[PDB]
Design a protein around this ligand. Sequence first.
Ligand SMILES: [Mg+2]
Ligand SMILES: [Mg+2]
Ligand SMILES: [Mg+2]
Ligand SMILES: [Mg+2]
Ligand SMILES: [Mg+2]
Ligand SMILES: [Mg+2]
Ligand SMILES: [Mg+2]
Lengths: 172, 172
Amino acid sequence: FPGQTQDPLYGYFAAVAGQDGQIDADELQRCLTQSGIAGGYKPFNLETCRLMVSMLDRDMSGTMGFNEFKELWAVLNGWRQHFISFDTDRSGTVDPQELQKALTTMGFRLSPQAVNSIAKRYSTNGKITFDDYIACCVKLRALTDSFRRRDTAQQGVVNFPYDDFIQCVMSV
Amino acid sequence: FPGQTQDPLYGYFAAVAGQDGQIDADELQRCLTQSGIAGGYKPFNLETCRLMVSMLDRDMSGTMGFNEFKELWAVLNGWRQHFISFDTDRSGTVDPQELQKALTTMGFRLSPQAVNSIAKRYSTNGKITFDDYIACCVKLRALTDSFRRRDTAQQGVVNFPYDDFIQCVMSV
Ligand SMILES: [Mg+2]
Ligand SMILES: [Mg+2]
Ligand SMILES: [Mg+2]
Ligand SMILES: [Mg+2]
Ligand SMILES: [Mg+2]
Ligand SMILES: [Mg+2]
Ligand SMILES: [Mg+2]
């Protein structure tokens, strides 16, 4: 009984959720905007929301419930902290070098080539929005889990048949 | 030089290109819309255009020049025609079984399982839109190029170190 309280995140979710207690990507975009997790920056774009839904969609419903929303909140905060470290000018954007450190402090060791190829895919006039940073974190997590589960020899090299490579990457 | 003419695509490009002769995804979105490549279908959204830029970004600039735009136009025409052979009444969508026959007619060599996962990734109410079909085609061709390049022995298997895998899959 004692030590219970109203979850402060519940309100944002109930404002957008259907009577079934579920939200889809569009509904997720709205309540994330409301939640202030993107701060003063722009809303997450709809591809970023699709990625976030897919990340937590364990019943393959195309939707999430409130418990998953709270899980998502925890994940997004972890990643946001690394971002606001190196968002030294409060831009809501990081440059490629800043990005490299954020991902580094998260424990990704990526080469300058891997970072540059991430930056160029999501740059907007040479800088990466918080929105695109989050999309990138979601994809990195999924593709890294895909790589790791196939590393039989445990030397950081995976033997990828073509068909498996395609399904694996196209599924994200 | 006889047979020289003004290239009819140059105008669409020159209207949005910077003085450097380059376009980013936003600009490409605009000039593909003007160009009429969609026919009666809806315009491509930004994310599909980012994929397009990435498919032809041989110098990792995050932009495209006019010659690459010219290539892109040819490629899209070919894909649009296959799409239309399965969307006779121009609804703007195609279903999963038709997507499979499209990809095989296209030259993509994919297991029924792989095609299934691709159809599920791009379904919305059991239907694949035109924008999502093109996004799929772009992504398949880019990832298949990256794979082919690492498989000059043509064994259909590539040994991918983690950093190269990431560089490669995050760029598209
Ligand atoms: Mg679900
Ligand atoms: Mg900054
Ligand atoms: Mg002419
Ligand atoms: Mg721009
Ligand atoms: Mg035209
Ligand atoms: Mg380029
Ligand atoms: Mg039909």
